[PDB]
From a paper:
Cryo-EM reconstructions reveal modifications to a canonical capsid protein fold, resulting in capsids that are abnormally large for this virus class. Structural information on the portal protein, through which the genome is packaged, demonstrates that the capsid influences the portal’s conformation.
Spherical capsids with thick serrated walls were present alongside larger, faceted capsids with thinner walls in lysates of [name]-45–infected T. thermophilus cells. The smaller capsids, hereafter referred to as procapsids, were in higher abundance than the mature expanded empty capsid. Empty and DNA-filled expanded capsids appeared to be of the same size, with the diameter of the circumsphere at ∼82 nm, compared with ∼66 nm for the procapsid. Single-particle reconstructions imposing icosahedral symmetry were calculated at 4.4-Å resolution for the procapsid and 3.7-Å resolution for the expanded capsid. All residues for the expanded capsid could be modeled, whereas the procapsid model contains all residues except for 23 N-terminal and 12 C-terminal amino acids, for which there is no clearly defined density, suggesting flexibility or disorder. Segments of residues 24 to 45, 62 to 76, 93 to 105, and 126 to 136 were modeled as poly-Alanine due to lack of interpretable side-chain density. Other significant differences between the expanded and procapsid states are in the N-terminal and C segments of the capsid protein, residues 1 to 23 and 398 to 409, which engage in subunit interactions in the expanded state but are disordered in the procapsid. The packaging activity of procapsids was low at 50 °C, with minimal activity observed at 20 °C.
Numbering used by the authors:
A (entry chain A): 24 to 397
B (entry chain F): 60 to 117
C (entry chain B): 235 to 397
Write the structure that this text describes.
Amino acid sequence: KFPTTKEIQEAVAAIADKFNQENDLVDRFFPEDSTFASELELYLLRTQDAEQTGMTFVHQVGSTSLPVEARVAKVDLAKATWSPLAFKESRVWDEKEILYLGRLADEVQAGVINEQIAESLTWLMARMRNRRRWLTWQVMRTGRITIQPNDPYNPNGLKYVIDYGVTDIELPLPQKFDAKDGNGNSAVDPIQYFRDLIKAATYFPDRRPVAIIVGPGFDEVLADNTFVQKYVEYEKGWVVGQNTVQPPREVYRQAALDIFKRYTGLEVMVYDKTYRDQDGSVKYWIPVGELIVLNQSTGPVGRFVYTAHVAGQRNGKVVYATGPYLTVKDHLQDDPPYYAIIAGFHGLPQLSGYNTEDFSFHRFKWLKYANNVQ
Amino acid sequence: ASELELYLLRTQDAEQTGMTFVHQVGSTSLPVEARVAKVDLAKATWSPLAFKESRVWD
Amino acid sequence: IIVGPGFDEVLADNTFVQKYVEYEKGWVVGQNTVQPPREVYRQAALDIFKRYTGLEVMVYDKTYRDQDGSVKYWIPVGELIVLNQSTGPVGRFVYTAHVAGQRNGKVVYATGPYLTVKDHLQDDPPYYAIIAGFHGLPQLSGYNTEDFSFHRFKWLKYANNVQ
């Protein structure tokens, strides 16, 4: 029954087409890249534009041309020291339960085996894709990758801390937004706050908040903000002394995202899925409250790199596979008989082109603003 | 067939996400917890109710 | 008018532009509001200006990087420049002095970007270098020959605070 490795590859290509048919924000920001190397250069360097422009030289006649300072290239002379974190696992089936399920099927052994194997393949691909998502998200929400020994996806307890060195991924806040002062009032306008971010980025071309990202519920914090309430009241045209007595809450809940999107002008792309840990909880990739925000531009950023494979090289010389590797195993001839399969590869998300004139690089930052959510 | 299985089964989503494993170099793979199809092992007890009828004329 | 940077806030602080938006969008500060927010004015400033005065407001910031690493724009913050004859190509940029050998014969020089390299790998530092450069000047479009003056474009200053 459990056979057909070439058909397993075909059905795996079908499952990958089904997985990559839909796409996500976090998937959109990083393409899939594959290298035969393993040096794991943590960031590329790419900063040469009219923001780094400079202007040319006067000279009078009769002399040699005074040379061009190219100190960005000499500053770019450095090395990249980081190590690729693999991720790999394998699902196994005991022959006892496969003859249990073969007698349970009893109409097509290889067909129900094909269905069950392809189901487990799709689920394990989902585990792979969520590993990739947790990598990319764990760096972009905190600037760096940290592995404590107590991850539900770290049973071994292997720890790693690999940093990339974004300057300030956090943002200043004197307090959260929805603190209540006076009788009942917002502490601060968020829209006027992001106006202050643009006001600070008056000079600076890469502080200006371009497009914001927040997945779960945050709208209600806006709906409680009496500044945003006042925007909605002036927008739709109600004085609480004269035109209305008290507006209701789902007005604010309806209009807050759009009035924010119009008045601040940065896009609010809301894209959360969930990750299901071992502990039974269901959390979103974004945690509730806080929100990351791009403030240079909007486009791709970084790179998800496939670190090269360790495999049987060839009969002679060395060469390796470079994509999603796939192979089957039997241990049914053995003292515990078990049928197992393995596909999960070595990889790393890389950051974008670092700035080259200085070493600083901050394109995305975040702030925490919700001391009570649920 | 007429066995009348009381429930179908289909559940594989991002609320059933899972992820890969932090494994070190050069060791054996820590394998997959197989709780899904093991907990799925059950038998259904239901029976079809056939609905049949026939008019007649005097 | 041509002006690059954020001056829309400087528009929004002008209370006549405020009262423009107040009556135009239909809000009395005595009756229909106590005070409107600042950022409706921010959203409305360039549009209320363009529909009211009726001249094309082409707003264009360009990132100007000088030697000491700070960032500016070509137009400085605040003020403006303004055309007042027509919209159309004023001026011209002239590239002169196509320098080479003068020649073995007569001067019939080329007119475009010529570039050449200079290797010096034989020398006391053995170095490699490239040259390019343009002897040039922007030539303004001259007046109609009646007067001596030519004023197609002027400006004024108001940014008594930069920030």
